[PDB]
């Protein structure tokens with residue numbers, strides 16, 4: 133099934149639970165500007181190859197649009213549009229002065245050399261310069277793009293811009309040497325930890341000494357486990373990568389597990405732990421569960437088997453709506469996916485603020501501001517959850533769409 137249709141259906145289901153005019157819904161069902169450009173680069177053999185680049189700006193009622201750039205061979209305009217629509221609600225739920233945006237290039241970056249990658253980044257900037265800017269559209273790292281590409285892109289934008297303004301703020305996720313921000317490596321995990329702490333506070337659970345299980349041991353999963361163990365004082369009992377999983381009731385040390393992963397290539401056969409698979413790992417009796425891996429892991433097949441009191445969807449939509457209803461029926465508190473992992477876009481917003489102001493913060497200041505933003509967003513969503521007696525995901529959609537609708541009404545875009 134197409135992704136943009138999925139996003140529009142999600143938006144309509146959200147609008148079912150809130151009072152929104154028909155014209156506003158029709159406005160929100162369409163991206164406000166879609167730009168498709170040709171991105172020509174000259175390769176190492178001397179030939180010129182043309183790639184397809186996208187830049188979708190779904191809505192900018194609340195402010196300049198925000199969103200990353202994907203370099204995937206399976207990129208489509210539908211995927212970019214759906215992700216921009218998703219980014220609108222993501223920045224709206226955590227109360228940022230941002231709209232929704234998304235870019236992408238249909239390219240296999242594995243077959244490109246470093247020089248070709250730099251040429252691709254610079255050519256993409258030259259192609260989409262007319263629709264981006266510090267106050268118009270702020271790109272960011274995404275799938276198969278990294279801070280190196282972000283720095284190349286910022287340099288090209290500054291060259292075109294003739295240094296007439298804050299060219300550092302045109303793009304986020306930059307290296308620290310050029311307008312980069314601290315806390316940019318643990319943003320998602322720190323936001324997830326703050327949301328988990330707030331959820332435990334709401335449920336009355338003290339996390340000191342409790343159990344956590346994490347699926348997926350990449351950046352997000354590893355940092356989530358590490359920050360949970362240190363800040364929340366919890367007992368990490370199960371971690372897993374795409375290969376396999378391990379279990380130890382007394383507690384695992386995430387640093388040692390990461391070292392083992394680096395050495396042997398996987399978390400398999402970790403000393404002192406029992407090797408398990410992802411599916412049973414999802415069903416251990418643990419206080420909180422943090423799926424930080426491939427989407428759609430909790431379905432109707434295993435939804436009733438979840439024994440976790442809190443499920444923090446660190447990954448992008450790892451739970452299906454049927455599993456959502458089943459989990460809610462069990463009383464299991466769910467943190468919606470675009471609320472749990474909203475720390476990354478919040479820290480990107482902080483980086484943009486630092487670049488715009490010309491003044492840069494420390495790690496402690498970024499951490500405290502992230503704490504404030506995530507706590508306030510979670511409490512807003514939870515209060516909507518209780519007041520409307522609807523699902524947590526539905527409450528997050530209600531909050532985001534209500535904010536965007538209010539901004540649209542204030543500008544006079546929609547009269548009703």
Ligand SMILES: N[C@@H](CCC(=O)O)C(=O)O
Nearest residue numbers: 200272273274476477480
């Ligand atoms: N959420 C996307 C892009 C949003 C942003 O960081 O600005 C990402 O994973 O990078």
